[PDB]
Amino acid sequence: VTGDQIASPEYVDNLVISAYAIWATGDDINSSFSLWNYDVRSDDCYKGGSGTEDGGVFNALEISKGINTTDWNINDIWKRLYQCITRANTALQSLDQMDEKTYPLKNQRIAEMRFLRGHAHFMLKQLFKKIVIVNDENMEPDAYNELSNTTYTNDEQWQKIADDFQFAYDNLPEVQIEKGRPAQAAAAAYLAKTYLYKAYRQDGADNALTGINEEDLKQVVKYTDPLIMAKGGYGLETDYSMNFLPQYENGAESVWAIQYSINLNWGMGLTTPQILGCCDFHKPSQNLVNAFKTDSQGKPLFSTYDNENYEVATDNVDPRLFHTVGMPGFPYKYNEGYIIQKNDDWSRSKGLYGYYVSLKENVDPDCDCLKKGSYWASSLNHIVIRYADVLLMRAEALIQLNDGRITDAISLINEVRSRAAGSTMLIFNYKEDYGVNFKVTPYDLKAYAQDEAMKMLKWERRVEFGMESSRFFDLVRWGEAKDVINAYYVTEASRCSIYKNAGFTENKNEYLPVPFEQISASNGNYTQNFGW
Ligand code: NA
Ligand code: NA
Ligand code: NA
């Protein structure tokens, strides 16, 4: 009955499109949904910019000192991520009322919105730990006003996120024509990722690891099953570099990505190098550059890598370095017209934060995909889930299960590591032209003890996902952020003097404080993180 329809298809589809759109337009230069601004806490990178006071709140995060519950940036990322949840919930409110006879893709669209809701809650959970679960799109103002971030235990909060991805897995198609819409495999991947983070229990009052749960790990293994992934045709790109190039978007490795177009990615506006005039943020560390060094057999220098800086002429190196970090003497993003130098064209801080450039989010300066507004921004997609992460999540789970499948996990690591060894498509002249000694070899498929296998796993993550803003979150997952980050502060202070007085406090700095503005507005319903 035409005049009795509260919501037409067009209007509901517009709500759905709006719920996607906020992922491209809802963030900003100091609050990117990549969360790069927060991964300055890791051993992968430095804040950059003009100096320590250019984003003082982010300097404080970088060194773990002088962070406040009231900091503007902390409240802002909370609010921006909750705005994404609000839009997904608005769409669901209308979708729930639709008649499938009128709107045949009702259930699939519901699944899309639940997936987006899960994406936002997952990132909030990584950042803040103790979060509000806003999963009732039909909630009245009174119920809405009594929401709390301790209604659910830590483990239950992870379960609630998983529940959204589970629905999504159960209801999404295997293949999407419109690639920004998640497919079944993307829900499976994110469900697995949720269970992986859930498995490393923090079931006590503080942020310490209390156990590693096997049932959660079995869910990771279940939802990374290559038979599931095959239904969507997902797999490694032929060459690693293709993950980060405009003409290779939506490939087999792009399990799920945010779609930009010439809607540019303004949230990366600060991370362009100084050669474009601004802003030199998000700078690879010397520690990360050194982590690409390899031994005479093509393996990581597990205990010695960081003792001397990478030296092109003499050292074996992983090709992934040259897709991750732009270094002095080399082309910027594969463009021989822009050779990086140790000078003020390649530093906004006279060298304080060094001369490395993060390549992954940057494009060829001649790209038609690159525009200048207030800042320079491109249409390069942001991949939330790369297939390499599926394989390495699977390996991690298998290694933690330690139930006779560590050799299977090594085989998985080797699919990623072998791919890196061959990844010279746009850098194949670097031996002849620059003296680069490429050497990466897969591991022998023999019996490894669990701790050795886990070391190999962590190391493969390090070189696979440098500068992709999950390194800090991994260290917290693993319960070792204080030790790894404090050791990095000690070693990196001789290279970047911003770390002189750095120091991480365990059972405090594993997460951001819940923002005070939020606590205050909740009238006692929100609880602060341990140690804050
Ligand atoms: Na850092
Ligand atoms: Na690349
Ligand atoms: Na630079």
mmCIF file of C-alpha atoms in Angstrom, residues 51-424:
data_model
loop_
_atom_site.group_PDB
_atom_site.id
_atom_site.type_symbol
_atom_site.label_atom_id
_atom_site.label_comp_id
_atom_site.label_asym_id
_atom_site.label_seq_id
_atom_site.Cartn_x
_atom_site.Cartn_y
_atom_site.Cartn_z
ATOM 1 C CA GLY A 51 58.545 19.450 16.309
ATOM 2 C CA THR A 52 57.292 17.939 19.539
ATOM 3 C CA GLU A 53 54.673 20.635 20.056
ATOM 4 C CA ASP A 54 53.161 20.184 16.596
ATOM 5 C CA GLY A 55 50.383 18.015 17.997
ATOM 6 C CA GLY A 56 51.585 18.045 21.595
ATOM 7 C CA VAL A 57 48.899 15.528 22.705
ATOM 8 C CA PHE A 58 50.379 13.065 20.121
ATOM 9 C CA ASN A 59 53.883 13.643 21.350
ATOM 10 C CA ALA A 60 52.591 12.756 24.774
ATOM 11 C CA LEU A 61 51.152 9.501 23.344
ATOM 12 C CA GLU A 62 54.402 8.759 21.515
ATOM 13 C CA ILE A 63 56.459 8.931 24.731
ATOM 14 C CA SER A 64 53.649 7.682 27.127
ATOM 15 C CA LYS A 65 54.075 10.824 29.322
ATOM 16 C CA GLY A 66 51.700 13.706 29.924
ATOM 17 C CA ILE A 67 48.639 12.068 28.397
ATOM 18 C CA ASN A 68 45.469 13.386 30.094
ATOM 19 C CA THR A 69 41.954 11.932 30.452
ATOM 20 C CA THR A 70 40.757 15.284 29.101
ATOM 21 C CA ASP A 71 42.870 15.444 25.934
ATOM 22 C CA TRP A 72 40.895 16.868 22.989
ATOM 23 C CA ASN A 73 42.106 14.169 20.534
ATOM 24 C CA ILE A 74 41.056 11.265 22.772
ATOM 25 C CA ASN A 75 37.521 12.523 23.153
ATOM 26 C CA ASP A 76 37.415 13.406 19.433
ATOM 27 C CA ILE A 77 38.301 9.806 18.178
ATOM 28 C CA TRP A 78 35.771 8.334 20.618
ATOM 29 C CA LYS A 79 33.061 10.662 19.325
ATOM 30 C CA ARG A 80 33.954 10.190 15.638
ATOM 31 C CA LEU A 81 33.857 6.377 15.900
ATOM 32 C CA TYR A 82 30.539 6.507 17.792
ATOM 33 C CA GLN A 83 29.146 8.733 14.972
ATOM 34 C CA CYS A 84 29.858 5.865 12.558
ATOM 35 C CA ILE A 85 27.876 3.542 14.853
ATOM 36 C CA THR A 86 25.029 6.053 15.009
ATOM 37 C CA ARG A 87 24.766 6.120 11.202
ATOM 38 C CA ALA A 88 24.806 2.321 10.935
ATOM 39 C CA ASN A 89 22.104 2.137 13.592
ATOM 40 C CA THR A 90 19.959 4.725 11.800
ATOM 41 C CA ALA A 91 20.126 2.594 8.692
ATOM 42 C CA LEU A 92 19.226 -0.513 10.661
ATOM 43 C CA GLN A 93 16.258 1.215 12.311
ATOM 44 C CA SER A 94 14.721 1.709 8.869
ATOM 45 C CA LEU A 95 15.954 -1.625 7.441
ATOM 46 C CA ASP A 96 14.377 -3.583 10.292
ATOM 47 C CA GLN A 97 10.943 -2.246 9.313
ATOM 48 C CA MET A 98 11.233 -3.100 5.575
ATOM 49 C CA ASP A 99 9.225 -5.841 3.889
ATOM 50 C CA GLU A 100 11.438 -8.219 1.938
ATOM 51 C CA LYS A 101 8.851 -8.345 -0.840
ATOM 52 C CA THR A 102 9.439 -4.599 -1.365
ATOM 53 C CA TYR A 103 13.106 -4.621 -0.409
ATOM 54 C CA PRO A 104 14.476 -8.060 -1.309
ATOM 55 C CA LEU A 105 18.047 -7.409 -0.096
ATOM 56 C CA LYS A 106 16.826 -6.464 3.403
ATOM 57 C CA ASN A 107 18.808 -9.140 5.158
ATOM 58 C CA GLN A 108 22.009 -8.532 3.210
ATOM 59 C CA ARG A 109 21.817 -4.764 3.887
ATOM 60 C CA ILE A 110 21.193 -5.466 7.590
ATOM 61 C CA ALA A 111 24.345 -7.632 7.490
ATOM 62 C CA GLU A 112 26.324 -4.775 5.828
ATOM 63 C CA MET A 113 25.256 -2.355 8.576
ATOM 64 C CA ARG A 114 26.048 -4.841 11.375
ATOM 65 C CA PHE A 115 29.466 -5.349 9.835
ATOM 66 C CA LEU A 116 30.102 -1.586 9.831
ATOM 67 C CA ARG A 117 28.880 -1.397 13.451
ATOM 68 C CA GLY A 118 31.252 -4.198 14.315
ATOM 69 C CA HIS A 119 34.155 -2.381 12.546
ATOM 70 C CA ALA A 120 33.605 0.750 14.663
ATOM 71 C CA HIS A 121 33.196 -1.165 17.983
ATOM 72 C CA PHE A 122 36.327 -3.236 17.223
ATOM 73 C CA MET A 123 38.479 -0.128 16.725
ATOM 74 C CA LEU A 124 36.969 1.526 19.842
ATOM 75 C CA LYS A 125 37.767 -1.677 21.737
ATOM 76 C CA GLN A 126 41.415 -1.655 20.575
ATOM 77 C CA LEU A 127 41.807 2.026 21.504
ATOM 78 C CA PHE A 128 39.904 2.210 24.798
ATOM 79 C CA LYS A 129 39.177 -1.347 26.025
ATOM 80 C CA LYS A 130 36.208 -0.494 28.226
ATOM 81 C CA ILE A 131 33.588 0.561 25.693
ATOM 82 C CA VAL A 132 29.872 1.082 25.380
ATOM 83 C CA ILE A 133 28.133 -1.591 23.284
ATOM 84 C CA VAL A 134 25.491 0.299 21.226
ATOM 85 C CA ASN A 135 23.907 -2.610 19.405
ATOM 86 C CA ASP A 136 20.206 -1.940 19.808
ATOM 87 C CA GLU A 137 19.271 0.334 16.976
ATOM 88 C CA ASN A 138 15.690 0.532 18.337
ATOM 89 C CA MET A 139 16.717 1.786 21.793
ATOM 90 C CA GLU A 140 14.541 4.525 23.393
ATOM 91 C CA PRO A 141 16.084 7.809 24.780
ATOM 92 C CA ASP A 142 15.759 6.553 28.445
ATOM 93 C CA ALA A 143 17.593 3.231 27.806
ATOM 94 C CA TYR A 144 20.059 5.173 25.591
ATOM 95 C CA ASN A 145 20.742 7.623 28.376
ATOM 96 C CA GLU A 146 21.593 4.824 30.859
ATOM 97 C CA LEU A 147 24.223 3.130 28.631
ATOM 98 C CA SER A 148 27.387 2.052 30.440
ATOM 99 C CA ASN A 149 30.886 0.840 29.462
ATOM 100 C CA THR A 150 30.704 -1.869 32.182
ATOM 101 C CA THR A 151 27.381 -3.513 31.435
ATOM 102 C CA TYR A 152 29.531 -6.250 29.917
ATOM 103 C CA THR A 153 32.768 -7.817 31.124
ATOM 104 C CA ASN A 154 35.850 -7.446 28.927
ATOM 105 C CA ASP A 155 35.270 -10.878 27.403
ATOM 106 C CA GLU A 156 31.552 -10.235 26.869
ATOM 107 C CA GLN A 157 32.309 -6.932 25.142
ATOM 108 C CA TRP A 158 34.532 -8.816 22.635
ATOM 109 C CA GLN A 159 31.659 -11.365 22.241
ATOM 110 C CA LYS A 160 29.198 -8.639 21.377
ATOM 111 C CA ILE A 161 31.489 -7.416 18.557
ATOM 112 C CA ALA A 162 31.857 -10.973 17.307
ATOM 113 C CA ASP A 163 28.062 -11.316 17.303
ATOM 114 C CA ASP A 164 27.739 -8.590 14.705
ATOM 115 C CA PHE A 165 30.385 -10.173 12.441
ATOM 116 C CA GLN A 166 28.746 -13.563 12.950
ATOM 117 C CA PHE A 167 25.393 -12.241 11.696
ATOM 118 C CA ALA A 168 27.283 -10.656 8.819
ATOM 119 C CA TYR A 169 29.064 -13.951 7.971
ATOM 120 C CA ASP A 170 25.730 -15.747 8.011
ATOM 121 C CA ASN A 171 23.966 -13.294 5.704
ATOM 122 C CA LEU A 172 26.403 -11.630 3.303
ATOM 123 C CA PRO A 173 26.869 -12.836 -0.245
ATOM 124 C CA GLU A 174 30.088 -14.567 -1.226
ATOM 125 C CA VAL A 175 30.760 -11.998 -3.954
ATOM 126 C CA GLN A 176 29.902 -8.281 -4.130
ATOM 127 C CA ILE A 177 29.796 -6.280 -7.369
ATOM 128 C CA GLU A 178 30.245 -3.041 -5.445
ATOM 129 C CA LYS A 179 33.541 -3.715 -3.769
ATOM 130 C CA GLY A 180 33.144 -1.400 -0.779
ATOM 131 C CA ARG A 181 30.370 -3.638 0.476
ATOM 132 C CA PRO A 182 31.769 -6.480 2.662
ATOM 133 C CA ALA A 183 31.516 -10.009 1.317
ATOM 134 C CA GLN A 184 31.039 -13.151 3.418
ATOM 135 C CA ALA A 185 34.802 -13.684 3.610
ATOM 136 C CA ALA A 186 35.389 -10.192 4.958
ATOM 137 C CA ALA A 187 32.947 -10.951 7.790
ATOM 138 C CA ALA A 188 34.724 -14.249 8.362
ATOM 139 C CA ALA A 189 38.103 -12.447 8.478
ATOM 140 C CA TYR A 190 36.886 -9.808 10.886
ATOM 141 C CA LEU A 191 35.128 -12.391 13.036
ATOM 142 C CA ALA A 192 38.465 -14.213 13.203
ATOM 143 C CA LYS A 193 40.303 -11.036 14.075
ATOM 144 C CA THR A 194 37.763 -10.330 16.857
ATOM 145 C CA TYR A 195 38.274 -13.841 18.303
ATOM 146 C CA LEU A 196 42.046 -13.440 18.112
ATOM 147 C CA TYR A 197 41.947 -10.265 20.154
ATOM 148 C CA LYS A 198 39.381 -11.810 22.522
ATOM 149 C CA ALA A 199 41.577 -14.953 23.044
ATOM 150 C CA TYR A 200 44.355 -13.127 24.853
ATOM 151 C CA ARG A 201 42.317 -12.646 27.996
ATOM 152 C CA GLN A 202 42.441 -9.670 30.320
ATOM 153 C CA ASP A 203 39.849 -11.090 32.706
ATOM 154 C CA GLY A 204 41.228 -9.342 35.852
ATOM 155 C CA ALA A 205 40.772 -5.736 36.867
ATOM 156 C CA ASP A 206 43.944 -4.470 35.120
ATOM 157 C CA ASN A 207 45.368 -4.891 31.563
ATOM 158 C CA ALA A 208 47.579 -7.941 32.217
ATOM 159 C CA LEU A 209 47.136 -11.167 30.247
ATOM 160 C CA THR A 210 45.273 -13.700 32.376
ATOM 161 C CA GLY A 211 45.227 -16.607 29.905
ATOM 162 C CA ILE A 212 44.929 -17.555 26.268
ATOM 163 C CA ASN A 213 41.589 -19.118 25.522
ATOM 164 C CA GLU A 214 41.541 -22.167 23.212
ATOM 165 C CA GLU A 215 37.895 -21.841 22.234
ATOM 166 C CA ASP A 216 38.430 -18.293 21.011
ATOM 167 C CA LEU A 217 41.532 -19.531 19.103
ATOM 168 C CA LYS A 218 39.536 -22.360 17.511
ATOM 169 C CA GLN A 219 37.122 -19.704 16.233
ATOM 170 C CA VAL A 220 40.064 -17.938 14.532
ATOM 171 C CA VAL A 221 41.018 -21.161 12.827
ATOM 172 C CA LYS A 222 37.410 -21.786 11.850
ATOM 173 C CA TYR A 223 36.872 -18.374 10.290
ATOM 174 C CA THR A 224 40.206 -18.154 8.488
ATOM 175 C CA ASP A 225 39.552 -21.464 6.698
ATOM 176 C CA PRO A 226 40.944 -21.194 3.189
ATOM 177 C CA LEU A 227 37.778 -22.936 1.927
ATOM 178 C CA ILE A 228 35.768 -19.944 3.115
ATOM 179 C CA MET A 229 38.193 -17.481 1.571
ATOM 180 C CA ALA A 230 38.109 -19.325 -1.776
ATOM 181 C CA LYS A 231 34.405 -18.590 -2.136
ATOM 182 C CA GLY A 232 35.413 -14.920 -2.537
ATOM 183 C CA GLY A 233 38.579 -15.567 -4.499
ATOM 184 C CA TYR A 234 40.781 -13.925 -1.802
ATOM 185 C CA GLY A 235 44.546 -14.333 -1.784
ATOM 186 C CA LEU A 236 47.963 -12.680 -1.816
ATOM 187 C CA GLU A 237 48.697 -10.086 -4.487
ATOM 188 C CA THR A 238 51.332 -11.326 -6.908
ATOM 189 C CA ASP A 239 53.610 -8.502 -5.690
ATOM 190 C CA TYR A 240 53.386 -6.920 -2.215
ATOM 191 C CA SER A 241 53.496 -3.418 -3.683
ATOM 192 C CA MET A 242 50.131 -3.822 -5.407
ATOM 193 C CA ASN A 243 48.378 -3.374 -2.016
ATOM 194 C CA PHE A 244 49.421 0.283 -2.004
ATOM 195 C CA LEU A 245 49.066 1.511 -5.589
ATOM 196 C CA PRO A 246 46.103 3.349 -7.144
ATOM 197 C CA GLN A 247 45.949 1.208 -10.287
ATOM 198 C CA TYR A 248 45.852 -2.078 -8.368
ATOM 199 C CA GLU A 249 42.838 -1.391 -6.137
ATOM 200 C CA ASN A 250 40.237 -3.942 -5.028
ATOM 201 C CA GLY A 251 42.528 -6.867 -5.859
ATOM 202 C CA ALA A 252 42.410 -10.400 -4.456
ATOM 203 C CA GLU A 253 44.204 -9.281 -1.268
ATOM 204 C CA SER A 254 41.833 -6.426 -0.505
ATOM 205 C CA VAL A 255 39.475 -8.414 1.670
ATOM 206 C CA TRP A 256 37.801 -5.257 2.828
ATOM 207 C CA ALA A 257 38.664 -1.652 2.071
ATOM 208 C CA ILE A 258 37.407 1.884 2.406
ATOM 209 C CA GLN A 259 36.750 3.277 -1.079
ATOM 210 C CA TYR A 260 37.942 6.844 -1.898
ATOM 211 C CA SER A 261 37.560 8.673 -5.271
ATOM 212 C CA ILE A 262 38.405 12.044 -6.951
ATOM 213 C CA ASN A 263 35.748 11.680 -1.423
ATOM 214 C CA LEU A 264 39.566 11.907 -0.964
ATOM 215 C CA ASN A 265 41.331 10.475 2.075
ATOM 216 C CA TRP A 266 41.758 13.797 3.991
ATOM 217 C CA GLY A 267 42.686 11.872 7.184
ATOM 218 C CA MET A 268 46.139 11.148 5.672
ATOM 219 C CA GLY A 269 46.665 14.863 4.860
ATOM 220 C CA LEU A 270 49.530 15.296 7.320
ATOM 221 C CA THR A 271 51.602 12.279 6.129
ATOM 222 C CA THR A 272 52.767 13.613 2.791
ATOM 223 C CA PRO A 273 56.511 14.370 2.724
ATOM 224 C CA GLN A 274 57.932 17.859 3.048
ATOM 225 C CA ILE A 275 58.782 17.916 -0.681
ATOM 226 C CA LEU A 276 55.089 18.682 -1.243
ATOM 227 C CA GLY A 277 55.280 21.673 1.208
ATOM 228 C CA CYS A 278 53.693 19.880 4.197
ATOM 229 C CA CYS A 279 53.495 18.034 6.622
ATOM 230 C CA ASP A 280 56.013 15.306 7.295
ATOM 231 C CA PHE A 281 53.930 13.360 9.864
ATOM 232 C CA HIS A 282 53.936 9.552 10.379
ATOM 233 C CA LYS A 283 57.630 8.919 10.009
ATOM 234 C CA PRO A 284 59.170 5.474 9.903
ATOM 235 C CA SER A 285 61.608 4.836 12.751
ATOM 236 C CA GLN A 286 65.191 3.646 12.379
ATOM 237 C CA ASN A 287 64.085 0.628 14.465
ATOM 238 C CA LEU A 288 61.580 -0.342 11.733
ATOM 239 C CA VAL A 289 64.117 0.217 8.943
ATOM 240 C CA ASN A 290 66.510 -2.044 10.757
ATOM 241 C CA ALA A 291 63.879 -4.699 11.250
ATOM 242 C CA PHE A 292 63.998 -5.402 7.483
ATOM 243 C CA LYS A 293 67.618 -6.544 7.699
ATOM 244 C CA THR A 294 68.226 -10.241 7.079
ATOM 245 C CA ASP A 295 70.993 -12.640 7.913
ATOM 246 C CA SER A 296 73.194 -14.546 5.431
ATOM 247 C CA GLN A 297 70.408 -17.137 5.068
ATOM 248 C CA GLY A 298 67.565 -14.616 4.427
ATOM 249 C CA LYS A 299 66.027 -14.748 7.958
ATOM 250 C CA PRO A 300 65.370 -11.916 10.402
ATOM 251 C CA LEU A 301 68.178 -10.837 12.727
ATOM 252 C CA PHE A 302 66.017 -11.676 15.732
ATOM 253 C CA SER A 303 68.481 -10.666 18.467
ATOM 254 C CA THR A 304 70.948 -8.341 16.639
ATOM 255 C CA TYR A 305 69.046 -6.404 13.963
ATOM 256 C CA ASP A 306 68.959 -3.106 15.808
ATOM 257 C CA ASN A 307 72.625 -3.022 16.922
ATOM 258 C CA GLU A 308 73.795 -1.178 13.798
ATOM 259 C CA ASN A 309 71.696 0.703 11.248
ATOM 260 C CA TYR A 310 70.904 -0.878 7.913
ATOM 261 C CA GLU A 311 73.708 -0.259 5.421
ATOM 262 C CA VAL A 312 72.673 -0.730 1.839
ATOM 263 C CA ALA A 313 76.118 -1.777 0.517
ATOM 264 C CA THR A 314 76.764 -4.571 2.959
ATOM 265 C CA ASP A 315 73.516 -5.850 4.441
ATOM 266 C CA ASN A 316 71.003 -8.360 3.221
ATOM 267 C CA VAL A 317 67.499 -6.869 3.273
ATOM 268 C CA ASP A 318 63.795 -7.755 2.801
ATOM 269 C CA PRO A 319 62.223 -6.212 -0.312
ATOM 270 C CA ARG A 320 59.277 -5.083 1.819
ATOM 271 C CA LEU A 321 61.513 -2.263 3.159
ATOM 272 C CA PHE A 322 61.351 -0.573 -0.202
ATOM 273 C CA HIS A 323 57.548 -0.698 -0.340
ATOM 274 C CA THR A 324 57.260 0.561 3.239
ATOM 275 C CA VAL A 325 59.895 3.242 3.811
ATOM 276 C CA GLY A 326 61.291 5.948 1.529
ATOM 277 C CA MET A 327 64.915 6.388 2.449
ATOM 278 C CA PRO A 328 67.620 8.897 1.513
ATOM 279 C CA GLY A 329 69.251 8.058 -1.800
ATOM 280 C CA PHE A 330 66.183 6.266 -3.195
ATOM 281 C CA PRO A 331 63.149 7.230 -5.313
ATOM 282 C CA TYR A 332 60.046 8.414 -3.478
ATOM 283 C CA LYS A 333 57.155 6.030 -4.260
ATOM 284 C CA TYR A 334 59.046 4.642 -7.309
ATOM 285 C CA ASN A 335 59.425 8.032 -9.017
ATOM 286 C CA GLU A 336 63.119 8.577 -9.972
ATOM 287 C CA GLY A 337 62.418 12.305 -10.353
ATOM 288 C CA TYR A 338 62.098 12.545 -6.525
ATOM 289 C CA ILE A 339 65.196 11.189 -4.840
ATOM 290 C CA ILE A 340 64.928 11.414 -1.038
ATOM 291 C CA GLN A 341 67.749 13.382 0.638
ATOM 292 C CA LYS A 342 68.868 14.219 4.164
ATOM 293 C CA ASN A 343 67.809 17.929 3.827
ATOM 294 C CA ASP A 344 64.898 20.295 4.568
ATOM 295 C CA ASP A 345 63.032 19.213 1.452
ATOM 296 C CA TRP A 346 62.528 15.880 3.305
ATOM 297 C CA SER A 347 62.181 17.118 6.873
ATOM 298 C CA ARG A 348 59.913 19.642 8.506
ATOM 299 C CA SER A 349 61.857 19.613 11.790
ATOM 300 C CA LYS A 350 65.469 20.090 10.584
ATOM 301 C CA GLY A 351 66.090 16.412 10.998
ATOM 302 C CA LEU A 352 64.683 15.899 14.514
ATOM 303 C CA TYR A 353 62.277 13.143 13.275
ATOM 304 C CA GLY A 354 64.654 11.963 10.544
ATOM 305 C CA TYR A 355 64.408 11.638 6.821
ATOM 306 C CA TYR A 356 62.228 8.527 6.245
ATOM 307 C CA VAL A 357 58.837 8.712 4.515
ATOM 308 C CA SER A 358 55.912 6.339 4.998
ATOM 309 C CA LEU A 359 55.236 5.013 1.451
ATOM 310 C CA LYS A 360 52.097 2.941 1.933
ATOM 311 C CA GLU A 361 49.519 5.732 2.210
ATOM 312 C CA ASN A 362 51.406 8.036 -0.199
ATOM 313 C CA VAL A 363 51.266 8.045 -3.976
ATOM 314 C CA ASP A 364 53.454 9.062 -6.926
ATOM 315 C CA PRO A 365 53.496 12.861 -6.765
ATOM 316 C CA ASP A 366 52.554 12.933 -10.489
ATOM 317 C CA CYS A 367 49.438 10.773 -9.856
ATOM 318 C CA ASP A 368 46.152 12.107 -11.171
ATOM 319 C CA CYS A 369 44.752 10.564 -7.946
ATOM 320 C CA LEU A 370 46.558 13.253 -5.830
ATOM 321 C CA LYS A 371 44.796 16.639 -5.114
ATOM 322 C CA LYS A 372 45.684 19.683 -3.025
ATOM 323 C CA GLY A 373 43.025 21.242 -0.784
ATOM 324 C CA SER A 374 44.260 22.583 2.596
ATOM 325 C CA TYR A 375 46.391 19.420 2.576
ATOM 326 C CA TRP A 376 47.424 16.974 -0.123
ATOM 327 C CA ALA A 377 45.150 13.894 -0.269
ATOM 328 C CA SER A 378 44.633 10.969 -2.651
ATOM 329 C CA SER A 379 41.924 8.480 -3.631
ATOM 330 C CA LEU A 380 44.136 5.437 -2.724
ATOM 331 C CA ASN A 381 41.868 2.896 -0.965
ATOM 332 C CA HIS A 382 42.553 2.129 2.700
ATOM 333 C CA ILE A 383 42.556 -1.697 3.057
ATOM 334 C CA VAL A 384 41.183 -2.620 6.520
ATOM 335 C CA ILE A 385 41.832 -6.354 6.033
ATOM 336 C CA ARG A 386 44.602 -7.579 3.755
ATOM 337 C CA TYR A 387 44.680 -11.305 2.981
ATOM 338 C CA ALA A 388 48.185 -11.540 4.433
ATOM 339 C CA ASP A 389 46.619 -10.686 7.797
ATOM 340 C CA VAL A 390 44.157 -13.617 7.362
ATOM 341 C CA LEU A 391 47.061 -15.989 6.847
ATOM 342 C CA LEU A 392 49.097 -14.592 9.722
ATOM 343 C CA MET A 393 46.100 -14.538 12.074
ATOM 344 C CA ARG A 394 45.563 -18.194 11.219
ATOM 345 C CA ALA A 395 49.256 -18.993 11.883
ATOM 346 C CA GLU A 396 49.111 -17.130 15.224
ATOM 347 C CA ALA A 397 46.056 -19.067 16.355
ATOM 348 C CA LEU A 398 47.563 -22.390 15.314
ATOM 349 C CA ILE A 399 50.817 -21.598 17.140
ATOM 350 C CA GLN A 400 48.957 -20.535 20.320
ATOM 351 C CA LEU A 401 46.816 -23.721 20.196
ATOM 352 C CA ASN A 402 50.050 -25.844 20.123
ATOM 353 C CA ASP A 403 48.005 -28.901 19.228
ATOM 354 C CA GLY A 404 50.176 -30.382 16.470
ATOM 355 C CA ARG A 405 49.727 -27.768 13.772
ATOM 356 C CA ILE A 406 52.790 -25.519 14.260
ATOM 357 C CA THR A 407 54.295 -26.890 11.006
ATOM 358 C CA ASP A 408 51.023 -25.879 9.236
ATOM 359 C CA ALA A 409 51.459 -22.380 10.755
ATOM 360 C CA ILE A 410 55.079 -22.158 9.465
ATOM 361 C CA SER A 411 53.766 -23.092 6.010
ATOM 362 C CA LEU A 412 51.379 -20.167 6.296
ATOM 363 C CA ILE A 413 54.084 -17.763 7.358
ATOM 364 C CA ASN A 414 56.107 -18.967 4.363
ATOM 365 C CA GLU A 415 53.253 -18.120 1.923
ATOM 366 C CA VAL A 416 53.625 -14.484 3.066
ATOM 367 C CA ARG A 417 57.409 -14.566 3.365
ATOM 368 C CA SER A 418 57.906 -16.165 -0.110
ATOM 369 C CA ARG A 419 55.627 -13.623 -1.630
ATOM 370 C CA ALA A 420 57.897 -10.870 -0.171
ATOM 371 C CA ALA A 421 60.996 -12.517 -1.627
ATOM 372 C CA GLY A 422 59.631 -12.156 -5.164
ATOM 373 C CA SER A 423 58.183 -8.665 -4.661
ATOM 374 C CA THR A 424 60.552 -6.629 -6.848
#
